[PDB]
């Protein structure tokens, strides 16, 4: 089971927007250019995969993703995964889809928290994974 983070958690510091595409396309070898792009939920499913390796339907994950139902899709894979591993953060899924910039920010900052307490330091190929 994983580390929970909840707002009364004691956290590093924020991260920049340029800081955040950083870990995230450092991390995934991506190219994202706005975090608006999390929208797709692909990102997320592959930093599951990484934090819990299987814990994750990686195969049905849709990372060339273009469409709002597709984001959908990917969302109900990383609830699956966050519901394994007995995360109990609730993904405002229906908001995160529409792809805008200040609810996609919120909660990657929190993702990131998630992520910073749980991962284990192991080396990962994002590329072979997709």
């Excluded at 955040?20 to 792009?37: D, H, R, V, Y």
């Excluded at 939920?41 to 049905?60: N, T, V």
């Excluded at 792809?99 to 990657?108: L, P, S, T």
Aim: aromatic share 14%; net charge positive.
């Amino acid at each position: 089971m994983a580390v929970n983070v909840y707002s009364t958690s004691v956290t590093s510091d924020n991260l920049s927007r340029h800081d955040m595409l950083a870990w995230i396309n450092e991390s995934l070898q991506l190219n994202l250019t706005k975090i608006e792009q999390l929208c797709s939920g692909a990102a997320y499913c592959q930093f599951m995969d990484m934090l819990f390796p299987g814990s994750i339907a990686l195969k049905k994950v849709k990372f060339q993703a273009k469409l709002e139902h597709e984001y959908i899709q990917n969302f109900k894979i990383l609830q699956a995964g966050f519901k394994r591993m007995g995360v109990d953060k609730i993904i405002p899924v229906d908001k995160l889809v529409k792809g805008k910039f200040q609810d996609n920010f919120e909660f990657v900052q929190w993702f990131k928290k998630f992520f910073d307490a749980n991962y284990d330091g192991k080396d990962y190929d994002p590329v072979a994974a997709r």
